[PDB]
Amino acid sequence: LLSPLQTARQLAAEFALTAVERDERGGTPKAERDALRDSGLLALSIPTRYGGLGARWSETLQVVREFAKVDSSIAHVFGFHHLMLATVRLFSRPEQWQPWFEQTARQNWFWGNALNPLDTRTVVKDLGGWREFSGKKSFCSGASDSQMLIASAVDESNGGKLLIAAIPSGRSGITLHNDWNNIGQRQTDSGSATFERVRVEESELLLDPGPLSTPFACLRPLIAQLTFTHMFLGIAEGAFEEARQYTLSETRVWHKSSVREVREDPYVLAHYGEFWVALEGIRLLVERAAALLDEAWAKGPNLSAEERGHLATAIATAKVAASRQGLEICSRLFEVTGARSTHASLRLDRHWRNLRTQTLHDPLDYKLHELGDWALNQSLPVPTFY
Amino acid sequence: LLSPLQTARQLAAEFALTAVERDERGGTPKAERDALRDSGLLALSIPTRYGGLGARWSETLQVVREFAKVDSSIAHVFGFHHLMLATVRLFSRPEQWQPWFEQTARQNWFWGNALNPLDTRTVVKDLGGWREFSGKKSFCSGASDSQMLIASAVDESNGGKLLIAAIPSGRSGITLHNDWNNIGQRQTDSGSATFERVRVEESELLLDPGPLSTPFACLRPLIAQLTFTHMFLGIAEGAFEEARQYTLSETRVWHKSSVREVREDPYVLAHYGEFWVALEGIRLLVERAAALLDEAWAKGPNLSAEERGHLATAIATAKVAASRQGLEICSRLFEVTGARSTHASLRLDRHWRNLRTQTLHDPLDYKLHELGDWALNQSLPVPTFY
Amino acid sequence: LLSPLQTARQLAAEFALTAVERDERGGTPKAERDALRDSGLLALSIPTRYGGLGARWSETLQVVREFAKVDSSIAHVFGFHHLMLATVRLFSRPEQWQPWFEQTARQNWFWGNALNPLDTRTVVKDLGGWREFSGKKSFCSGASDSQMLIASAVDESNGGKLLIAAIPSGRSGITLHNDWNNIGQRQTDSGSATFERVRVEESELLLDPGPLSTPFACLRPLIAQLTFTHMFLGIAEGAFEEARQYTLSETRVWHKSSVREVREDPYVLAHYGEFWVALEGIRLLVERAAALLDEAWAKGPNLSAEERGHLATAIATAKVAASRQGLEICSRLFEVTGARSTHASLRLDRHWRNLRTQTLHDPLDYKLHELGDWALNQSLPVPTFY
Amino acid sequence: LLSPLQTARQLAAEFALTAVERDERGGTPKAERDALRDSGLLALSIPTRYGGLGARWSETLQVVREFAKVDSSIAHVFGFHHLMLATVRLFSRPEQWQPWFEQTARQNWFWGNALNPLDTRTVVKDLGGWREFSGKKSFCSGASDSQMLIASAVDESNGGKLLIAAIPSGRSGITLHNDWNNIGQRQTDSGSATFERVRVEESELLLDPGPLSTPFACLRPLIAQLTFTHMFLGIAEGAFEEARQYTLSETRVWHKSSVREVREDPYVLAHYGEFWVALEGIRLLVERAAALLDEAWAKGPNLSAEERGHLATAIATAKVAASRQGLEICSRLFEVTGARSTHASLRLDRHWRNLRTQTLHDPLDYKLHELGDWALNQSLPVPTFY
């Protein structure tokens, strides 16, 4: 009866009831992941001809942003789920990803991450008709309580070429350790995994056209980067709104203030003006990047390298603004909520913690280096794994 | 044969040949204003039915922004000219502004500013069938070398209510001092004037609906504020482009640098990345406000107070970002141009000086206060004179 | 055999072995407080003629700063203990504070805080030869596991004047709730308490000269403010040292870096240069304020209001720099420690959490307001309760 | 009748009467340089046994700071004059610098700069008993209206080794072009020069111990760096004080302000609090560097490399804070002086211009790299020319 956005807004209102408790507990949010299974949003990005909803990427990422306002962990695993589907859609043949799309929309499969282009501990051995992955991996976001995984391994014999495959999460030889113990993103299950002679069929390798091939295939790392960017904006929007309610309800004026109510304090209003200017700038940069992704995705295999590069620059521009100005909002909001807002039962610092931990996996200094290379030299970004 | 934007860019190229020498000289850019007269751009905002070009406000403000990249003083007087035309359009009867629009488009009249809501020195005396303005005025931007002026006066008999009129710039009793001597905006002719029993006919009064009346009439201060905003963006864009060319042509690497060329220095590239993130955020905010102005203007006298309020918030949001981040670009650009870019023949500081002097008339602390009142209390800004 | 600074450093080393686990646990650090009892440092500020160690305030605050580098909660309760001793020294007669100094140095009494000038719930009733406190109090830092408390109450019969007393922490009618549950300062025991007809003798009242009386007595709020300031500097120094060791031991260079080791990465070195500039500025400001406190304290009751005012300005100046630049260090350090430094077993965010929660009780916007009133108008700050 | 500091304060009060006019004119401040000749301050740094005043370096640099508050150009040439005397004192034999010291104190010689370790256009040829310098030089601060110059040349035959000499400014073959045309430091005469077969005696070469030899000799670039640092603080202190007088005298409240007078506006006072916190931090860092220079200078040829390095780090720390926070003060002060403070007759932007132009010859990014190398790796700075 409701559109995807309304369905996501209804789920997020329910997630918000337990978001503070679940930040303290951590672990796997089994009940929340089951609600995502039952809502049908796991097929949001799948076209209608496969039983999906057929949303544009801007709409899919809008839901990730909506979840990140109340629960950035749920947003992370949800956004990564659609990133895994985008991975098989871009790296494999239609004979592969079409059945995967159909089965996902029908059985509500949850896709987790086991792909790390820097963790080289997992290697692949060829046994003729099948492959075997062996080694350890780190940062396996969404691996727990998932049906499918995107797993990677290095060749060693082929100069260390990276190999990507789509395998069931419960396949023999895969061990999810569930050792994720972080200060933020505490319910993304980004722990480690162990692969011991994990059989991989040739029909499960994502080779045509494979990673980092056509500019269309090179949308994969950009989708990953723009997924985090929508999460960052959502975190800041959620921290801003929760700070707004605390200021208006349970915040007393400083005893030296000239205003009787905190709604009219000049310094408080100045802080809120700063938050607004920052958020409005981030919103437009993120949404423009989302619109450019929609138009680039529509090009399909005809996508040009120049258009891919202009999209990469727009995404990184939004990601820098979302990272820096978003983190400043999550810290400065305490100056308008008051000394009583630091009570442990509120966990108001969770927004800063979640944003602080995720903005580190992609150092801002090297993104500014790339944006400056474009601004000064008109150099397009080089396609690499995210 | 050429669109107004192409005509503006062609003028801006010629203006740039003398912009540095004219910044030192100050005074009235008479040759540059005569080029605007012969270009037809003085009728840009006038609808085609009155002999004008019929551009939307976003297109007119884009030309203001394009002139500001090379000559912010010309952009200032050009934007204020169209602001004066919007003043009679919004405040007076069609029997008044229609002939004014017709004669302006036909004779290329240059409209100047003699309106100062915060200067109480000019008073109006009612003689019966006509009135007379008497007093002193300051900040009369574009008054010199103009054909018409928007002049204001206070009625000390009616509690000090402000009265606005449109009178010929050379009417008996009007004396222009040409004492404009400022560190920035040095060719805006913003000196002082003296009114000695200047006759004002009743037909020249802007009374129906008059200033600060309907939401449509309350677009006048927003157009003024958005005109400065496009100028602020243009100044920053011009300083960026000029710094870019200097970095690529004359700047030498520091002797202790790691790169052999300044194009690859990581600190230089990081600075340009910061400039790009800042500029892209300003550009989207400014263009978004321009689009809402187009949509608001199209409503005409059916414009609601709520839609006017959302436009005011969008304009102020873009003005804060353009003012703060723009001035930071005009200062930090010297860190990538080098110690030899401060030669007085280049006047590279003129962008900073122009932006620094103009951001003072609208103090940012009170704009942040207004934006915070909306962000926290959802209070729409009260329409006032700009 | 060891100086007090050497004894403090030796304790700080042992405290650091469990500081991370105790930050998660919260509650009362009973073992750490017993170590302070056996170390003799509870008599650090007491003159040698009363059995104490006779340190100057700069030396006592240096120990607070040294404890804050590894355990800001212990530094908080340790600094407040000496603040309570300064309270009776400045507010009461020598016939009162001399025996208190003697017994404290001889029995290693731990003095806690029950003073809250902004909590009007505790009232005093005059029964004739004695009085009784009744009401509820919050933010009772160091009240648990303490021998003496500085308690306050309001006299609703005399216009609400605040009355301060020094009473045993275990006197009949005093109930400690131990409900302190905060994101930071998690072992300061700053929970709430309830006073049920708690008898207070006239000899226990701090009336001569009493609070906010002479300039010498007005040093009490400045000592409190400077105690937090040394804690803020210590937190930032501790976070810096811990980030330094992590950078040199566990941090790995970004895969797109230009250096083979993280020690030579230009962005990493630039961050550490910013931390050094920030820390050196804070250190000098804090130590300069400590020196003026020593000189002010030496004047005794001959202290002038002007010298007290210049000290207040120097302390607030150092507190602003320590608060703002300190918190920035605690956040930006993650950009040089890396994505693997956010593991929950390290609790590297504890420095930010501790500093973020404590800077809220003294809002910086009003400290800047006070400092501007001196910088512009040369107006000395009015002595008030801290 | 007056001490050096009082004499400098009396000169600076007279310089301030014409500082605004002379910023516009530029050129050589002949009258002001003659006042320095007549005051005896040109012998401030010369010991008493040579007819000088015998000031410590902290006192000499204090005068440079005092001049920079009213006239940064005069401060620059005055500070460089004593830097030239320090050059012969550190690089040459007492048989050379002692007569130079005596003649300077007796005849009030003004020493100018012609030393540029990066401008390699001036070469030296050996003719047996004498040398000849030939080439062009840039940035010859204080060369005009001077009696002695420190001139440098490259050997070419000895692998390009730099050679430094002290020669009379009016020697045959030297041509001072007086083409200094800059946006700031407009009266330092930092134009170019031409050397055509300029004879240099062997007794005029500064070779024992020569440049960059002993750690004591390596104080020369540190004195140069600390001279600029005192100038930067003086510029910011002077801009702050001139802004203070304008705010209190001729600054109107914003018409939307709640305060009746500008002395009590909350945003204005906040800005002044920010200025105070910044200035106080810079003052302590600069003065601590000045004290360390005094103690290092007293070591003489016994100065250790470690003590020289710790001084270099302290100086650079003060220089970064003085450069960045000083420039921010010179820009932000316009937000408290108002829109009427940008009048060209005030030249209030001259403080920002002077500081902006000088902070570029020593890029802050590479100083932070050096301070970070110490903060992280305990690496002392490498002695190089300034």
Side-chain angles (χ1 to χ4, degrees), chain B residues 3-8 10-13 15-20 22-23 25-124 126-131 133-156 159-160 162-196 198-251 253-255 257 261-262 265-305 307-308:
Chain B
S3 74
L5 180 54
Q6 297 171 351
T7 301
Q10 192 184 7
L11 283 171
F15 292 166
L17 298 183
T18 63
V20 176
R22 289 184 289 104
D23 175 77
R25 180 183 312 145
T28 298
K30 172 60 177 174
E32 282 62 37
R33 299 167 58 88
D34 285 351
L36 294 174
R37 286 184 171 92
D38 304 330
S39 72
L41 295 183
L42 292 179
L44 182 60
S45 65
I46 298 179
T48 58
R49 64 169 298 191
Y50 310 112
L53 296 176
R56 302 177 308 268
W57 274 111
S58 64
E59 319 176 86
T60 301
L61 299 169
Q62 182 180 30
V63 169
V64 171
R65 165 184 176 185
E66 189 73 23
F67 284 153
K69 297 162 64 171
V70 303
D71 193 335
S72 70
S73 291
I74 283 297
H76 189 151
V77 298
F78 182 84
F80 261 45
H81 158 82
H82 295 291
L83 173 64
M84 305 308 128
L85 293 176
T87 299
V88 299
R89 170 65 183 91
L90 295 175
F91 295 169
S92 67
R93 309 181 308 275
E95 303 81 46
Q96 296 169 277
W97 60 261
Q98 289 179 134
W100 283 332
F101 276 17
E102 293 174 350
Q103 298 154 346
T104 295
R106 180 179 43 98
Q107 311 181 211
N108 292 281
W109 284 356
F110 222 121
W111 287 65
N113 172 65
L115 161 64
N116 196 328
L118 268 45
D119 199 332
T120 179
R121 288 179 296 172
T122 298
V123 304
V124 50
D126 189 6
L127 280 307
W130 76 109
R131 294 144 215 259
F133 288 3
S134 296
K136 290 162 291 188
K137 317 201 98 302
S138 58
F139 297 109
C140 298
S141 297
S144 302
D145 190 59
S146 69
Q147 281 66 36
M148 295 286 295
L149 290 178
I150 294 292
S152 58
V154 297
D155 182 9
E156 310 188 76
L162 193 66
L163 174 60
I164 309 182
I167 57 179
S169 309
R171 180 166 286 182
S172 173
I174 300 173
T175 304
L176 301 181
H177 300 328
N178 289 270
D179 54 333
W180 180 239
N181 200 20
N182 194 273
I183 70 175
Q185 298 298 93
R186 293 183 44 82
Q187 290 195 313
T188 55
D189 299 312
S190 300
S192 56
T194 296
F195 281 59
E196 190 181 23
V198 185
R199 183 183 173 107
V200 177
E201 319 295 334
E202 311 290 345
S203 66
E204 299 166 329
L205 296 179
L206 316 179
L207 289 174
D208 205 2
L212 299 182
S213 55
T214 60
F216 185 49
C218 292
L219 291 181
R220 200 276 178 186
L222 303 188
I223 294 179
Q225 188 180 169
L226 195 51
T227 292
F228 283 112
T229 301
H230 282 71
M231 195 185 323
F232 294 176
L233 174 55
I235 293 176
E237 290 187 311
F240 167 82
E241 299 175 3
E242 191 174 38
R244 207 181 70 92
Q245 291 305 133
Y246 196 97
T247 294
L248 296 174
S249 298
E250 310 294 340
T251 304
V253 255
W254 185 238
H255 70 95
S257 179
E261 295 176 3
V262 75
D265 185 286
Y267 295 136
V268 168
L269 291 179
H271 280 297
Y272 273 100
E274 301 253 15
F275 303 155
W276 182 256
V277 172
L279 280 178
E280 291 285 274
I282 301 171
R283 285 161 176 162
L284 295 185
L285 285 172
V286 175
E287 294 165 354
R288 195 269 304 267
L292 292 170
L293 172 57
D294 280 3
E295 297 166 359
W297 182 269
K299 305 297 198 313
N302 296 335
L303 183 69
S304 66
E307 182 176 343
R308 191 272 182 193

Side-chain angles (χ1 to χ4, degrees), chain A residues 181-182 265 271 342 344 356 366, chain C residues 181-182 265 331 342 344 365-366:
Chain A
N181 200 13
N182 194 273
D265 180 282
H271 286 290
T342 54
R356 170 76 289 179
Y366 289 89
Chain C
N181 200 20
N182 194 273
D265 185 286
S331 173
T342 52
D365 290 326
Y366 288 93

Side-chain angles (χ1 to χ4, degrees), chain D residues 59-73:
Chain D
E59 303 166 322
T60 298
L61 295 165
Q62 183 183 23
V63 169
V64 176
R65 169 185 177 185
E66 201 73 27
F67 285 156
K69 299 171 61 175
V70 302
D71 193 327
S72 64
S73 292

Side-chain angles (χ1 to χ4, degrees), chain A residues 76-105 107-122:
Chain A
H76 190 149
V77 295
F78 180 82
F80 263 25
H81 159 83
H82 293 284
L83 176 67
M84 304 309 128
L85 295 175
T87 299
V88 305
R89 169 64 180 86
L90 292 169
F91 292 175
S92 71
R93 298 186 160 170
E95 292 90 327
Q96 296 170 282
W97 62 260
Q98 289 180 320
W100 285 332
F101 273 11
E102 297 163 358
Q103 293 171 289
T104 300
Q107 308 183 34
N108 289 294
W109 286 357
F110 223 120
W111 286 64
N113 176 40
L115 156 79
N116 194 320
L118 276 61
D119 197 336
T120 53
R121 293 176 296 176
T122 301

